[model samples]
Each structure stands twice: as C-alpha cells, then as structure tokens.
Target: DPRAELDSTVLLTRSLLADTRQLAAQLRDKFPADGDHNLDSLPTLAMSALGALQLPGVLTRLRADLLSYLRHVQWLRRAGGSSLKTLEPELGTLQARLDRLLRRLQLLMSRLALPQDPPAPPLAPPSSAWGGIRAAHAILGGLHLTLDWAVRGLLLLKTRL
Candidate 1:
C-alpha cells in the first residue's frame, strides 16, 4: 500500500540521516588524511538509499561531487610537499565544485519546505605546502557542515511527510 511505502521511505530516510551524522562526526573528530575506510562507501550507500526514495537530482549530484572531492583530497594528502603548486589549482576546482553542490543542496532543501541557511564563506588555498594541508582541512570542514545540514533537513522532511 502507499502508506506502507511511505513508512518504509521514512525509515530509510532516518537511517540515511543517522549515517550522515556519524560520518560528519568522524570527519570532524578523526580528520582522516587519506581515503578512509569508514568513509569510502558512504556516498554509494547514500546514493542507493536516495535513489530508492526517488529524491531530487541535487542529491545525486551532491554525492557525485562528494566522491570527486574525496578523491582530490586523497591525492593532495599523498602528493605532499613538492606537488603543492600542481595541487593548488585542483583544490581550487574542487572548492568551486563543493560550493555549487552546497548551493544545489540548499535549493533542494528549500523546495522540500525545510529551512535554508546561508552557505558558509568560500575557502581560499594559500601558496604554501602547508596551505594545501590547511585547504584539505577546510574542505572537510565544509563537507561536515553540508552533511550535517542535509541530514537535518532530510530528517525534518521525513517527519513531516
């Protein structure tokens, strides 16, 4: 029945929100320098659940962008000192991509009748090798905020619907 399907969707949405929160916390606390085993499958898992729910296109795009951002961060971590010049431009690109994804998520949340908070200010990568590391930290920070807000919005929508 439609009600049963709705109930299932609500449960799945809750699970997704919980996972998102946990991942965001892990990113904040652990601050993994490379591709973390804990985080490796999250985007795929979230995509599967959101796809099942027939969520908006923004969610899909956001996951894809998250995956790309993770890949760039992992590379930045591995490249270390000499590659800072090369990696700086790539980080800038990833930052812009994240910004667009955040905007799309906010748009989707607003469409779902959820509160839309203003996005955080943009991150600027510095010229130093240490700056690349700092930029990675900043990127993770942005990701944590975006994921937390998304989970909150989705939870609110799940409860209402």
Candidate 2:
C-alpha cells in the first residue's frame, strides 16, 4: 500500500512537472527576442543530478527554493509587459500548481520517513531575478528546470529513508 501511494504521488508529480515545463516554455516563446539567448548565464542551481540527495533536510531546502521561485512568479504578475495579458493567467496557475505540490509533498511526508526539515532561514529569490524580460526568462526557464530536478532529488531519496 505504501509503495502504491508512492507510485501515485510520483506519477502525479511527474504529470504536474510536465505541465509546468510546458507553461514555462510557452512563456518563453512570448518574449520574441532574447528569451533563450545566452541563458547559460543564469547560474545552475546546486540541487540537480542528486547533488544534495543525502544532505540532511534537503527536502526542506528544496521547499524553500520553490517558495523563493513563487515569490518571483507573484512579482512577474505585476511587472509590466505586453506578455502579461497572456502570461498572467498561466503564471497564476504555476503558483497554484507549485503550492499544490508542496502541500501534496507534506501529506505524503506523513506517510513516509524522511528527515525532518531544519527550520528554514529567510531565503531570497535566487538573485535579482524578478524584473525585466531577461529575468522573466530566468524565472520561468530556471523554475522549469528546477522542478524536474527537484523531483529527481526526491526520487533519489525514495528508498534511502
């Protein structure tokens, strides 16, 4: 039964991640120029490729990162852009979807054994990352990558509990 629940959770997570990635890409397309250009300048986050897999409270840190990303999402909603009209609704969806994942992960935590989260410190958005079109691409694009890898980090923890 636990394995079934785990499967269900991961499946739902995978599905939600796919949707988020798609939305992230669509948002990028809206910025006709420089959306994907030189994106390598944005620093790659450290949580990927199971880099922090066994670190204590890794989930909590990942949670904090998602929270920070959400802050950028909210800022983007009010940040002026012609893309706002089309992208606002989807950004709102992205907010709710990510919040859903956090909530779902919390519930799933109750049924499993993972390290308890350390009390989080005040974390900021990954950088001066919530303004301008380049920042928009950074937020949308980086989050798309982060969520998938964050899930991968969780998967890395699956049996290590």
Candidate 3:
C-alpha cells in the first residue's frame, strides 16, 4: 500500500528519465546537450568505506538528483512550456539510452542495499526561479552527461568486479 506507492518513486523516476530525454530533443537547438550547460555537477551519495573495494562509490545520490532535476524541468515546463521554446515537438531514439541506464543502476543499487529515500534528501534548488528556457537547456544537457557517466561507472563495474 503505502510502501508500494512509496517505492513507486523508482518507476516515477523512470518516467521522468524517459519523458525528459524524449521531451528535450523535441526542444532541438534550444535544449541541445551543449558542452557548457552551466548546471552544477550531480550530487552523489556517500557510503561507509568498504576498504579494499572502493574506487567508485554508490550512485544512489546521483540517480536521486537525476530524478529530482528532470522533474524540475517538468515543473518548470508545467510552470510554462512557453519557456522551453514554443517551437513544437520531437524526441525519440534517446528513450533507449535513458531506459537501460536506470535498470542497470537499479541492479547495482539493489545488490549494494542502497537507500532509495523517495528520490530525495532535499536537493539544492536551481539557482533561478522558473529559469525559463535557459535553465531547462542546462538541466537537460547536464542530465545527458550525468547519464553517460553512470553508464561508464556501471560498465566499468563489470570490468572491475
């Protein structure tokens, strides 16, 4: 009941991951994954030192932030899509990339017994209020890099242990 609905955050995060990745491309040049997106790095979690095996730590916090901000863009858009560039619509292909990363990381999180915590811990709010299209662009761009980095982390885990 409460717990199932509570745990649904994962699914909701998945939805945001899918929706935003798809939606951002529809944004075209306005929301391109440009090199200097200006969003701060994704915040991550800290686990107790595992000693011998710890080149990289848990990404619970990373995914948490991913969920947090992706929805932030939605809220911004929900606040007003006009801000995201009232150009039109177009977002596909990336659904595949965004999809795999979540499942793979969920596997890692489960194996590690990481905390889920309602996709939260109170993330730092964006630097601006309803940052318009400019902020949405940076958010999507940052999300792309963050997703890419997670893939590498999990893939390297396969390489490592």
Considering every candidate listed, which one attains the maximal TM-score? 2
TM-score of structure candidate 2: 0.70
Q: What TM-score, to 2 decimals, does candidate 1 have?
A: 0.36
- C-alpha positional error of residue 131 in candidate 3 after TM-score superposition, expressed in Å: 3.6
The digit string of per-residue lDDT tens for model 2 on 27-145 reads 56765445353344334465444444453466666666676677667767766366465778877887888777777766666676555634332233333332356666676766777
| Alpha carbon lDDT of each predicted model | 0.46, 0.63, 0.48
**Model 2, runs deviating above 4 Å:** 32-44, 49-56, 113-131
TM agreement with the true structure for every prediction: 0.36, 0.70, 0.51
Poorest lDDT segment (10 consecutive residues) of candidate 2: 117-126
Q: In candidate 3, residue 71 scores what lDDT?
A: 53
Per-residue CA lDDT of model 1 for 30-129, tens digit only, reads: 3345443233312332332333244445454445546445554545545546635444555455545444554554555455553212222222334566
TM-score for candidate 3, residues paired by index: 0.51
Q: What is the Cα-based lDDT of residue 94 in candidate 1?
A: 50
RMSD of each: 11.5, 5.2, 8.5
Residue 25 shift from truth in candidate 1, angstroms: 11
